[PDB]
Design a protein around this ligand. Sequence first.
Ligand SMILES: Nc1ncnc2c1ncn2[C@@H]1O[C@H](COP(=O)(O)OP(=O)(O)OC[C@H]2O[C@@H](O)[C@H](O)[C@@H]2O)[C@@H](O)[C@H]1OP(=O)(O)O
Ligand SMILES: Nc1ncnc2c1ncn2[C@@H]1O[C@H](COP(=O)(O)OP(=O)(O)OC[C@H]2O[C@@H](O)[C@H](O)[C@@H]2O)[C@@H](O)[C@H]1OP(=O)(O)O
Ligand SMILES: [Cl-]
Ligand SMILES: [Cl-]
Ligand SMILES: [Cl-]
Lengths: 318, 318
Amino acid sequence: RPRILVPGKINPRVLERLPEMFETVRIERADAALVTADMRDVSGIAVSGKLPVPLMDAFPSLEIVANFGVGYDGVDVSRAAARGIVVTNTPDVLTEEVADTAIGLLLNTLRLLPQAEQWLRQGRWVREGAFPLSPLSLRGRTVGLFGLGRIGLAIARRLEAFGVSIAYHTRTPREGLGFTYHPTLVGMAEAVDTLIVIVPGTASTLKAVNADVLSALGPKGVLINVGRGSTVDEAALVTALQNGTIAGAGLDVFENEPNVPEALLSFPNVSLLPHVASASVVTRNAMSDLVVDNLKAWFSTGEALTPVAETPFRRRAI
Amino acid sequence: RPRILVPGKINPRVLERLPEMFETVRIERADAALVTADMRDVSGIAVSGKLPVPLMDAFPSLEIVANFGVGYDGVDVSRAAARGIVVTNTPDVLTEEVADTAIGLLLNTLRLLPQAEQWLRQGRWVREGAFPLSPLSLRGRTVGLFGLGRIGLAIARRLEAFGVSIAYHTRTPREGLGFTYHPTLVGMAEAVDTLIVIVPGTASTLKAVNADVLSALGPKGVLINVGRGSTVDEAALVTALQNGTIAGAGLDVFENEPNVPEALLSFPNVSLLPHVASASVVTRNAMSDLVVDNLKAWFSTGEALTPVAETPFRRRAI
Ligand SMILES: Nc1ncnc2c1ncn2[C@@H]1O[C@H](COP(=O)(O)OP(=O)(O)OC[C@H]2O[C@@H](O)[C@H](O)[C@@H]2O)[C@@H](O)[C@H]1OP(=O)(O)O
Ligand SMILES: Nc1ncnc2c1ncn2[C@@H]1O[C@H](COP(=O)(O)OP(=O)(O)OC[C@H]2O[C@@H](O)[C@H](O)[C@@H]2O)[C@@H](O)[C@H]1OP(=O)(O)O
Ligand SMILES: [Cl-]
Ligand SMILES: [Cl-]
Ligand SMILES: [Cl-]
């Protein structure tokens, strides 16, 4: 039985299923200092969140890192690729759930539904009367998708049924789609009033949503981020909201989670979520299964189910 | 200039636009006791909410009641029809908005987005970690629409794009629709796990969503009400939530607004909104305009724009 390390917290469903084929080794945090000599025969890792390189490099027989999540920016994939270590993620099983969350965050940002519920709950409806009318609406809006992969496309499909115009920006266009392609992010922003960020947390997208992009978005502009916090210049966003450069924002992700800058918490036109895009029991169970099934497919057939693009590897064993 | 009474609160856009053709007479509440002899020449009423019969019957020359809202259950239309008084409402201009709100409420109910935002705002994400996973999801659900007019149909169109099965219940079916028709409410409730109420507040629909309907809905059942509060047996709903007879509920409307029963406020699996379905500036402006435009069309051409089905009348100038 190959020995699989699980560092820090993970969904119990992963832990429950590992014993189908593996021996599990647990450490309470993703920290190289917790590794003992008895753990040097570890062949795989299952992890949610950050995998620091020194921890990854504590294991000479490491073959595979199974990442819990579609995003795998916590794993140093360049260093894993250099060591011949396959990295897997969890795409597809969460696509529709993340897309639903995106829509719910957008509607909450535009229509202030969470604030309206607080108004009611605080007893305000009875004595101060109706919750104020939301200055914004989805009606008449034009939505620009920054990124348009499996999730971006699922969001667009939902948006078509709400009667809004859809545009998108990607490095290279997609043939056979009726949505307006924009070759630049800034160009798309000028054209639209609602910008939904749904790209990976890469070097290429770092602070891509910046002062200029927000300024082009305009004074009715709404920013929704369900991608990675690093993609938005958090300082420029705060300034833009302060100045009324844009009208509102809804954020599921932040530069340095779980910390959210105090200035963002003060705005009445902002909706904030603690990275809940895939966070339902059913979808996290499917994600858990895919982490485990990837490990099982690797060790039993030598082919992972959902290796990442940087590591299209096949298992070599003596 | 015909004289139009506006009793109680209404959107200022109505009051701003009435002078295009009319003289406005205001009373601070919809109460017959505030009517003075100088007001007996009133020809029309523009009103939001309840029009008590004694107030309506204070005016011998009353020709038209222009209701602010698609719902006109606050107006006694039988008594208006018996007096030859035309009644108008505000359909169409709010259909998409109310449909968006319905979806947002459904997502918030299922995924607990407002609670998750509280968890963040209260500092829990930093201190305790991740918000707990939502036991429910929209994934794999089957939605039954109770009512399927302009708004019901707009909600269904959104839902198709979320990949869920759609069913409906109405008194008579609709030809040329791919959704499963159910001849009974209880029968639909058996077949589905998510029930969206979107019918008028009539005698026919009074307490239609009762103990039996909820029981058939089942232990994964979610009730969404964006119609009228009177349609749901509020006592049976409270009991059903207490017993775990159903899994959750989301409510925009209540039996006796703006009062909400304390028991509904205690449940962690319930989302509550203070009747905000149409409550954006842009949509309420369009509603305001339609109230006024109805009055203008009546007095200038003798034909209202959106008379209700019970009063297909044309003006006779006495
Ligand atoms: N520098 C960039 N500029 C513009 N678009 C970018 C850039 N880098 C990537 N994308 C797009 O992001 C999209 C990502 O789609 P998928 O790989 O299918 O992933 P999925 O939609 O499931 O998730 C995207 C992200 O959603 C987040 O939860 C997580 O961090 C994850 O990386 C593609 O359309 C991808 O399109 P393309 O490869 O650029 O044509
Ligand atoms: N007793 C009943 N049992 C079952 N369904 C009922 C019953 N009464 C009415 N409905 C349905 O409700 C729908 C109403 O459609 P609309 O008249 O076009 O109204 P809309 O969709 O704009 O608004 C419905 C209600 O949405 C509420 O916010 C507001 O109070 C308003 O009365 C139709 O499908 C109408 O269908 P039908 O006339 O019963 O075939
Ligand atoms: Cl989890
Ligand atoms: Cl994510
Ligand atoms: Cl209003």
